[PDB]
Design a protein around this ligand. Structure first.
Ligand code: HEM
Length: 189
């Protein structure tokens, strides 16, 4: 993964648990040679997997729980580190935005020439619901989609219930999320 991701992890951890913890984590994972992470430079995935392995131990939090928090941060992080207009161009509501994910990652591809993006297909069972299909070149990142989907609720001021209905690990083609989403009707009635 690009340093861009590894820095978000760093900033997320430093923001939440302080710098000295982040330094412990960085030490335990085996990556003290790196004085810092470079956004537009590809690194081996291991760096990432390894950080979370260290983080998980040092913070006593399971991996699943870290990725989830990370999915939410990412959304915010990318919009603040200067990809906010990409985000804005991608959609004006939650359903619209899901359709344009492959496209957005293809536009991101021009700045990140070695990207290996996820693939999402959206199927709109109605205006309060969809299935989301998530295909990836990597293992185990479905918790991160949970985090993102929640971060997208907040983005569109929508309440989103997400439940994973297919798990790749049990022998499916890809992970599938069933997502319920309501606006303010939730609140008023
Ligand atoms: C401008 C916004 C975004 C940028 C710049 C961005 C960029 C990236 C980058 C650099 C990676 C690492 C890929 C690699 O190093 O090979 C990545 C991974 C990922 N991105 Fe985004 N992305 C953005 C928005 C989103 C959004 C909104 C979602 C919402 C679902 C999303 C879902 C993911 C997922 C799931 C991965 C995991 C990779 C995998 O499954 O193989 N991204 N993205």
């Amino acid at each position: 993964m690009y340093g861009l991701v590894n820095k978000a992890i760093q900033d997320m951890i430093s923001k939440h648990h302080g710098e000295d913890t982040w330094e412990a984590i960085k030490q335990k994972a085996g990556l003290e040679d790196i004085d810092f992470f470079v956004g537009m430079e590809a690194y081996s995935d291991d760096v990432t997997y390894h950080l979370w392995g260290a983080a998980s131990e040092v913070l006593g939090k399971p991996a699943e729980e870290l990725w989830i928090a990370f999915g939410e941060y990412w959304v915010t992080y990318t919009s603040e580190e200067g990809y906010g207009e990409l985000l804005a161009s991608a959609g004006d509501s939650l359903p619209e935005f899901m359709e344009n994910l492959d496209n957005l990652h293809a536009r991101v591809g021009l700045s990140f020439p070695q990207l290996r993006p996820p693939a999402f297909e959206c199927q709109h069972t109605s205006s309060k619901s969809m299935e989301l299909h998530y295909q990836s070149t990597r293992c185990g990142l479905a918790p991160m989609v949970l985090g993102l989907l929640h971060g997208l609720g907040k983005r569109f001021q929508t309440k989103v219930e997400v439940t994973q209905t297919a798990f790749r690990e049990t022998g499916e083609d890809h992970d599938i999320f069933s997502i319920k989403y309501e606006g303010a009707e939730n609140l008023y009635f």
